[PDB]
Amino acid sequence: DLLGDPIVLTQRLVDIPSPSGQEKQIADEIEDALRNLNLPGVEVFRFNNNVLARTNRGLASRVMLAGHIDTVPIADNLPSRVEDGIMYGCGTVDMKSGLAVYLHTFATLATSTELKHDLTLIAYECEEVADHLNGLGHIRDEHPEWLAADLALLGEPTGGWIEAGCQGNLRIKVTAHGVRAHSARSWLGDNAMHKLSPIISKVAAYKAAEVNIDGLTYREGLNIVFCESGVANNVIPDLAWMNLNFRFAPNRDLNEAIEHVVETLELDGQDGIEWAVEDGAGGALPGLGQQVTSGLIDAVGREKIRAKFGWTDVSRFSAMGIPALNFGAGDPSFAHKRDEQCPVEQITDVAAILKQYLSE
Amino acid sequence: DLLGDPIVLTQRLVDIPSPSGQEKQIADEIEDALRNLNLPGVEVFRFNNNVLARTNRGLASRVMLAGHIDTVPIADNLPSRVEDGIMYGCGTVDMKSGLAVYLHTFATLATSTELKHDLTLIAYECEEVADHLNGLGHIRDEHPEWLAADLALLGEPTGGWIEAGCQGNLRIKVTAHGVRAHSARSWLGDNAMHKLSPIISKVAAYKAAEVNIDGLTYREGLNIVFCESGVANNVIPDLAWMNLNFRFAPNRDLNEAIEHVVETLELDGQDGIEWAVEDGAGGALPGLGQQVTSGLIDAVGREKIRAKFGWTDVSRFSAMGIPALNFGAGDPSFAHKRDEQCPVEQITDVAAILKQYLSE
Ligand SMILES: [Cl-]
Ligand SMILES: [Cl-]
């Protein structure tokens, strides 16, 4: 592992197969590439298949550099080979590029006297699987102190752009109960499916709330994504359920997001209707209006920064009270596509931006 | 085959296995039991596995006696054995009782000088299967003249009661089309499922119309019986469909029933929504207020006659412009139950009622 060059490290990390669960090797290499390379003041920490590292140069602000080392199950995309200006392979866009960059820059500026911000580097595992294996997850649960920082940056592929923060994510399953009866004697029973009619109506009528933050504009989303009901053409259904997916702006927290959905749809009070949260997640504030961030906005340009409507591990930091942004290489597409295309150029563009940000 | 006794014929017809498609034998026996028994003026007609027979004694009114000779697939219910006042077996309640009765009475009164009404007897096949194999169906299609009568009686199990007419049956499949999009960017797409919200609301708000006929009261039914939509928790569904089941009073015909549903739910005009009829069927008027029926009402009692909310082949006659009633033996339950229980008594009760009706 070089760490002396950005593009080489990428093609090096990509050629090391790391589909979720088997990040063992790529993790071990990164640890040893940092240890055998004896950077003074730099602390290396091995936690499962996560690799943490931090400097303690006193210093005012602190920047977090995080990225996942795992990939989606490989599909004839390894090893990698560069084809005239562009690198094809697996992971070239999903982190392994940004990861190479986040690693490279930390290896260099850790001992550079012109480092304006303390650095933490977290290369974590199992991002591509249920939130009970997530590397950042266990870290937050056992060693939260390591997450501490004044700004967090996630290597997620953004094509050199800054996709600031992320929106909260809430999935609720609304279930209506009735009683079976022959569809010709409907009155003898109670149509469960019809009970969702009022709740459905409010959802289809709901106009998503919208909020401005740091010059950015986040828009919410409330949609029915699953609706299943029925047992026979001549039987009044006694059971009907839905899946509501609520995407809330980073100015809300789960408890608020939940309370908003439950109040607006009147999930409590409606007889025969039960609801429950199947998945919840916090949003992420970009905090662009802070000095800790000033430099980075400049090294990228105010007109290359949009809001992230999706959800990334960026929230795990914002939960800790840490502003976070998505900043990586490769087009957001080719994400899990069986032909990840990453313009070899963006690798150096990003690495350049980071130095300008962390040196001014 | 006796035809000299009602209860014997029943236990005889039951012991002859006739699950849909194999009514061959039971059909052949009935034909030959009528032919070799040379009733003068009586015409016997063999059509597929249906057995028709009619008298032509001039006479004013004419009564139709119809019943299906087939059963639901047998399930350890044959042969049959009577257990102290009650007969257990397969078909003992689903027609084979009424069929025995309808046969018996036709064999007797066909040459009796005290027969007030001309008689047609139709013992048809494949009632227990899609309406493209139905015996009465093909008869109506090729030899409608045989269905001609002033009153029709179906041997369906009603436990000696008269279940008058039947309600129409309409199933429409409403389908909404949208466009896929990430549930966090819902605005980029169009939620198909939300498009059914207005139509669903009208259905859940619709109060079924209700009509009185001949002292009887029919109530309609409009219910969603199937609702399926969704492709992923993070994907705006582009496709959503429903199954509406409309049960209309016998004062409406299919074209009216359809037009009522389509107007009330505004199925035309709503953009992105297509609808289609999957199944339709006419209702059946009881016509109890007619002289042709006078006798039968008396031989049963005005307080043993209720309205049939379901649907029976009784409609196939009412379509021909012929009032029709459901009058059979055995409890309406035990219908397709793996233990058909028919009180051996009701066999003679019904046969008695019929004579009193057809002799006065
Ligand atoms: Cl996004
Ligand atoms: Cl009924």
Numbering used by the authors:
A (entry chain A), B (entry chain A): 10 to 369
Give me lines lifted from the publication on this model.
C. glutamicum is a Gram-positive bacterium that finds industrial use in the production of vitamins and amino acids, including glutamic acid, which is used in the production of the flavoring agent monosodium glutamate. The crystal structure of Cgl1109 reveals a dimeric structure from crystal-packing considerations and as also suggested by the PDBePISA server. The dimeric assembly is promoted by the smaller of the two domains of the molecule, while the larger domain is the putative catalytic domain.
The diffraction data for the Cgl1109 crystal structure were quite anisotropic and the effective overall B factors along the principal axes of the unit cell ranged from 60 to 110 Å2. The relatively high anisotropy and high B factors made the structure determination considerably more challenging than for many other structures at a similar resolution of about 3 Å. For Cgl1109, DEN refinement resulted in a model that is closer to the true structure, producing improved model phases that in turn provide a better starting point for automated model building. The improved model phases also provided more significant peaks in anomalous difference Fourier maps to better locate the six selenium sites of the protein. There were several regions that required correction of register shifts and rebuilding of α-­helices that were not corrected even in the second round of DEN refinement and automated model building. The final refinement employed residues 10–369 of Cgl1109 (a 369-residue protein) and other solvent molecules (one phosphate ion and one chloride ion).
